């Protein structure tokens, strides 16, 4: 097993596209921390685990610059690899309803509520790519762990095998990331297509 990710050099995202890239981080941004909250997590200054308070529970914008960018960088990157392996990432003409959705987030008359992915559709299509990028992330990290284990003197891995290999469970977490990124684009007027 020789795993080959796929090369992004060269490739740069349009400023279109990299706003996407930061929608989508704000996201997973709310998503973390709609999650903690209801684990019983809140705001505070300090994080301490006795109380349950944590820094990162406050609005994307109010993050430093560094804390967008965690969010940002593995959505920009996957964004490299749809335009590397040769589709087509562009946005249709789903034009206003990004805008729409801030101007109503923004509408009185921090919460996070994030856009419920559960309802979003997916084309056969976009399924099969689904797969192609959950098994690109099981490269990069099967690639990475080839070279650790490399450095060490050689070794093995129970999960240093083909993508195809293994189990659900297994596959779960890289097969969850593709999805996510691929429904958000869905209903942000962003059409991935071969």
Aim: net charge positive; with cysteine; glycine share 4%.
């Amino acid at each position: 097993f020789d795993p080959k990710p796929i090369n992004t050099m060269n490739f740069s995202l349009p400023e279109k596209l990299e706003y996407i890239v930061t929608k989508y981080a704000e996201h997973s941004h709310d998503k973390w921390a709609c999650d903690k909250s209801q684990s019983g997590w809140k705001y505070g200054i300090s994080l301490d685990e006795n109380v349950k308070t944590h820094p990162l529970i406050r609005p994307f914008k109010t993050l430093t610059e560094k804390e967008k960018e965690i969010y940002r960088w593995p959505a920009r990157e996957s964004l490299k690899t749809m335009l590397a392996v040769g589709w087509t990432v562009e946005r249709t003409k789903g034009e206003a309803l990004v805008q729409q959705r801030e101007n109503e987030k923004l509408r009185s008359v921090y919460s996070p509520a994030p856009l419920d992915l559960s309802n979003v559709v997916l084309s056969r299509e976009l399924q099969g790519m689904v797969e192609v990028v959950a098994e690109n992330y099981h490269n990069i990290w099967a690639k990475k762990k080839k070279l650790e284990l490399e450095s060490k003197g050689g070794g093995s891995h129970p999960l240093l095998v083909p993508y195809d290999t293994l189990t659900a469970a297994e596959k779960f977490k890289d097969r969850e990331k593709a999805q996510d990124l691929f429904k958000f684009l869905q209903v942000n007027g962003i059409i991935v297509s071969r």
